[PDB]
Amino acid sequence: QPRRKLCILHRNPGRCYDKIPAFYYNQKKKQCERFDWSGCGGNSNRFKTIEECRRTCIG
Numbered sequence: 613q614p615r616r617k618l619c620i621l622h623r624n625p626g627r628c629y630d631k632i633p634a635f636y637y638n639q640k641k642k643q644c645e646r647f648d649w650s651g652c653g654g655n656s657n658r659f660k661t662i663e664e665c666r667r668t669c670i671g
Contacts, residue, residue, distance in 0.1 A: 613639065614637055614639065614670065615668065615669055615670070616668060616669060618655070618656040618657050619637040619639065619657060619669035620627060620637075620639050620657070620667075621636075621647075621655040621656065621657035622634040622655075622657075623645075623647050623657065624653065624654045624655050624657075625647060625648060625649055625650045625653070625654060625668040626648060626649060626650035626652050626654040627652065627653045628650035628651035628652040628653060629650065629651065630650055630651030631648040632648060632649040632650070632651060633646065633648060633670045634646070634647060634648070634649040634658050634659060634660060634661075635651075635658070635661065635662050635664070635665040635671075636639070636646070636657040636658050636659070636665070636669075637657055637669040639667055640667070641664020642668065644659070644662050644665035644666055644669065646671070648656070648666070
């Protein structure tokens, strides 16, 4: 599947009040998608740019 195991993690915004535009890898759809990261919490399936998501999880 994806290149790394962090790529399978379920998307998680965390529990803070910010809304930071980021990407995560969507295993089910096989693509990088947008989400808003809250500023704390979350898991390592989160990238600042789509390019970063793509290289890391897709190639």
